[PDB]
DNA sequence: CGTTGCGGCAAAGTTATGGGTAAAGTCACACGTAGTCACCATAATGAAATAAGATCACTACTGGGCAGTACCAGACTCGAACTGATG
């Protein structure tokens, strides 16, 4: 929630798109239970650029 | 005393013993005495042998695990489509 009102204005497409995951697993990331994979972690990670 | 036998006294006579001195005997110098088996215990090896030890080979007995098979879901991810806000 933080991350996605901080540079995505509060959208899901730019940030999908920045890391190329489908916006299905952004969705299910941002809104339910599921855990992103360690490796979609921390890609996400680096594209903050923050460990 | 007058005579006769007996006994003491003190040289005198006879044996014995440890010394000295000339003189008849005595005997080694003659190449020669050391020299040679017999003897049985102890060290001392060197060989004979060990008594056990070392390893091979075989026979039988008994622990016991690996490559592979199989199901029942939970959970994340995402084609494919639905649907609402908008410039």
């Known amino acids: 929630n933080?991350?996605?009102?901080?540079?995505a204005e509060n959208?899901?497409?730019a940030f999908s798109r920045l890391i190329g995951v489908?916006?299905?697993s952004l969705w299910?990331?941002?809104s339910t239970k599921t855990l992103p994979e360690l490796n979609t972690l921390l890609k996400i990670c680096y594209e903050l650029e923050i460990s």
């Not at 933080?2 to 540079?7: A, E, H, L, P």
């Open 22 to 24: 489908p916006k299905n």
């Open 2 to 7: 933080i991350v996605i009102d901080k540079v």
């Open 28 to 30: 299910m990331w941002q």
């Open 11 to 13: 959208n899901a497409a």
